[PDB]
């Protein structure tokens, strides 16, 4: 019996499989940050913090003693509750193939929002700095949907100016993806040109990213550490409802702040 306590839930194994599949497909579809940054872990429930290898001096020390404190980045544990109907889960045992698992998708996208919002725009209460809020480069102000094929090159230029090599991925927020993929130049494709621009770089949709972003896929620049990977656990149940949660433990580090350029309002 681990912390997920799943054997205590009034849920048949096939209903557990259905819940897990729903969450898994949502996560594989929507986790923007995980498909860009470098990945450490998972290390389990007792991994508490990432060792940075840095030391910080302590001022009030005697003359005969040199003392320094080791610097570490603690992980955040995130739990998103959701509820399911017990009868809907029971129907799986009678051969039902489409039980109502709406709240599973809701909780999974809420977890995706939490993780990707931390990765891109930081999370100050967790001591995390995002990719966008840590870049020293000036944010290109894109004026219209047709300025993107220019802007990216400019951003890419900046990346190779500062010394950041490697394929450059384009990350599009909600409006940017909508406007640049609902567009067509009288038959001639535009998004095809967009992927043609980036040298074997991926183009990814991030629902939590405001605007757009161009960032290196070189590696060693952005680091997501996961202690406990995305899991479904059981909390409680009444006669008719069962309370579950999505759980994860993670932290994110910006190793090289200059490997990305932000593109403002699409």
């Amino acid at each position: 019996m681990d912390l997920l306590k799943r054997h205590l839930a009034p849920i048949v194994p096939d209903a557990w499989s259905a819940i897990d599949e729903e969450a898994k497909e949502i996560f594989q579809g929507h986790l923007a940050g995980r498909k860009l940054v470098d990945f450490r872990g998972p290390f389990g429930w007792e991994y508490a913090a990432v060792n940075t290898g840095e030391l910080r001096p302590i001022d009030d020390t005697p003359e005969d003693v040199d003392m320094k404190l080791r610097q570490v980045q603690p992980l955040a544990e995130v739990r998103v509750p959701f509820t399911l109907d017990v009868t809907e889960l029971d129907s799986v045992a009678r051969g039902a193939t489409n039980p109502d698992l709406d709240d599973v998708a809701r909780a999974a996208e809420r977890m995706v929002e939490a993780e990707d919002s931390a990765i891109f725009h930081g999370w100050a209460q967790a001591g995390i700095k995002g990719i966008v809020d840590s870049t020293p480069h000036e944010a290109l102000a894109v004026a219209s949907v047709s300025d993107f094929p220019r802007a990216v090159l400019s951003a890419a230029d900046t990346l190779r100016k500062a010394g950041v090599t490697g394929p450059y991925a384009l990350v599009l927020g909600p409006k940017a993806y909508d406007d640049l993929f609902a567009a067509t130049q009288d038959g001639y494709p535009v998004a095809k040109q967009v992927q043609r621009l980036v040298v074997d770089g991926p183009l990814v949709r991030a629902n939590a990213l405001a605007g757009a972003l161009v960032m290196s896929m070189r590696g060693g620049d952005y680091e997501l550490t996961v202690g406990q990977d995305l899991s479904i656990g059981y909390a409680f149940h009444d006669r008719s409802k069962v309370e579950l949660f999505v759980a994860e433990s993670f932290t994110f580090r910006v190793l090289e702040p200059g490997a990305a350029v932000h593109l403002r309002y699409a």
Partner: peptide, 9 residues
């Protein structure tokens, strides 16, 4: 006992 997502590259 996670969902086994891990890295998405």
């Amino acid at each position: 006992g996670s969902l086994g997502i891990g890295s998405l590259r």
